[PDB]
Amino acid sequence: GSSGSSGMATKARVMYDFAAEPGNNELTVTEGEIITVTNPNVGGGWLEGKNNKGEQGLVPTDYVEILPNDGKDPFSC
Numbered sequence: 001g002s003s004g005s006s007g008m009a010t011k012a013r014v015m016y017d018f019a020a021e022p023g024n025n026e027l028t029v030t031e032g033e034i035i036t037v038t039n040p041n042v043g044g045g046w047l048e049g050k051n052n053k054g055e056q057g058l059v060p061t062d063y064v065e066i067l068p069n070d071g072k073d074p075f076s077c
Contacts, residue, residue, distance in 0.1 A: 005072055010037040012049065012066040020057055027057025029064065040066060 014033050020026035027049055029035060039048035042058065047066070050056045 007069040010040060010066060010069070011035075012037050012040075012047070012064045014064045016063050018059065018063045020059075025058050027051065027055070027059050029059060037066060 011034055014029045014031050014035075017031045018029050020028040027035075029049075029051075035049040035051060037047060037049050038056065040061075042048055045061050046058050047061050047064070048056055049059055049064075
């Protein structure tokens, strides 16, 4: 029926409101705002996420902490 245990659709929640300079390879996000993770492993401790607009930019993993996915559910409790 389904495919994948953890899932490919990774999500991350912003802990602190971060701003990206105009005309830069960075993305602008806000605290509480969630986005789609595409490249969580860029190189150095950064990740690439896309916004509703469809734009992609670099964001400091220190500002946003990726959230886990639905892990293998436990057997009949």
